[PDB]
Amino acid sequence: MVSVSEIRKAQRAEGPATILAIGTANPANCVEQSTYPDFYFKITNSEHKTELKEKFQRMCDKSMIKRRYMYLTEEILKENPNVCEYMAPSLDARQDMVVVEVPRLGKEAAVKAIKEWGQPKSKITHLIVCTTSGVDMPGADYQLTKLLGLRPYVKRYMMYQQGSFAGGTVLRLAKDLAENNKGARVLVVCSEVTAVTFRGPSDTHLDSLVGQALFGDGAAALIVGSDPVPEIEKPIFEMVWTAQTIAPDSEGAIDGHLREAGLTFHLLKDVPGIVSKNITKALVEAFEPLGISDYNSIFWIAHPGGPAILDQVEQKLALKPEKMNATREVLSEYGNMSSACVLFILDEMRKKSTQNGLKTTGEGLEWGVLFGFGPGLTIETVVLRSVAI
């Protein structure tokens, strides 16, 4: 009787998964980067560790971040001395913060993205929620469902404790959800709060110190779907091919452990050099099949782990300086927001290109690449195409 192949032909979408809307949010508290070392040493009761402040000064001076947005305020840190210490039991206080903040911030971003899209929220068929800050049951995907008033049957993908490469990983997942299901509209939400990682300075874990110079909060939300309705929905970027890989020789480059003292990050190798050394290989796996080899001829999105990863990739490939502008603007204005970062980048780029009358949303170029970098050393690759105007 019932035929599965008829069911399967009727059930699937036909074209490429497309980004149809993008919206972001950050916590109100703006933290200036120039005065941060003072603030950070005072609030962590470390003024006396004079030599360690000099090193953080330099790290912030070199970060290429102007400001960061943070849920943690001095009023909040005053109330929490165990979080200002380098290693004290604090996971219950940090979880109370981030199980609420993560979905609140996520909701902000998602309302934005849904207004842009224009279409009834009841048409949202799937939800991906991604965060590296805290875990809970029901997850932030269930909170976000309630907060936004999504249908209770929305199909949910909760991606918890992912790491900084996961803006790449949510795209890679939405691609297949959108593409395999006719009519599917996926609401994608990356929301990262560093309240779980903030800790005091320690002269014997400089790698934790580097983290403290760079990470910032932010959420980004996307509407993803295949076969857009022309002149009703508005394609921004199309996803064409994706990959995930683990660099050779990179065991321990980036690890993070959730413990009683919260999420402690540990940098045990040369991340800038490991990305730069393996990005060519990623490029040729993505573009060799498209016949493209000039990497200045595609538009770029690269998670800005730190400025050094960017310079060292730019140097290695001979990218023109201009290739990393969008990526650097996002790093300057918001710091490293982990998984959300690459999505703020995509907004930046598409906004600048439209604002400035370029021919496509990918800086006037046809084909583009987004890279996610994080624990494992993992590299996520998504190949994009822009959309005219």
Interacting positions 189-248 with its own copies (CB under 8 A) = 238, 240-248
| Selected binder of its own copies within 103, 211, 228, 375 (CB under 8 A) | 375
210 binds, among ligand HXC, its own copies, none (CB under 5 to 8 A by kind): ligand HXC
Give residues 67-106 in contact with its own copies (rule: CB under 8 A). Answer: 89, 91-92, 95
| Cα gap 212→336, rounded to integer Å | 10
Give the nearer residue to ligand HXC in terms of CB position, either 163 or 200: 163
Tokens 């050394």 correspond to what residue?
277
- Other C-beta atoms within 10 Å of 39: how many? 13
118 binds its own copies (CB under 8 A): no
Tell me the C-alpha to C-alpha distance, in Å, between residue 274 and each of 51, 246, 255, 348, 378: 29, 11, 15, 27, 10
Q: Which does 148 bind (CB under 5 to 8 A by kind): its own copies, ligand HXC, none?
A: none
- Applying CB under 8 A, what is the total number of residues that bind its own copies? 71
Pairing outcome for strands 367-374 and 299-302? parallel
Partner interacting with residue 58 (select from ligand HXC, its own copies, none; CB below 5-8 Å by kind): ligand HXC
Sheet bearing 299-302, strands edge to edge: 155-160, 126-131, 185-192, 218-225, 18-25, 237-246, 378-386, 367-374, 299-302
Which residues would be at the binding site for ligand HXC (CB under 6 A)?
55, 58-59, 62-63, 132, 163-164, 206, 210-211, 254, 256, 267, 270-272, 305-309, 336, 338, 373-375
First to last CA, the chain: 49
Q: Name the closest residue to ligand HXC (Cβ).
A: 306
Distance CA 236, CA 71 (A): 30
- Choose the contact partner of 63 out of its own copies, ligand HXC, none; CB within 5 to 8 A by kind: ligand HXC
Residues numbered 309-348 forming contacts with its own copies, rule: CB under 8 A: none
Contact partner, 222, from its own copies, ligand HXC, none, Cβ < 5-8 Å per class: none
Element containing residue 345 per DSSP (H, E): helix 341-355
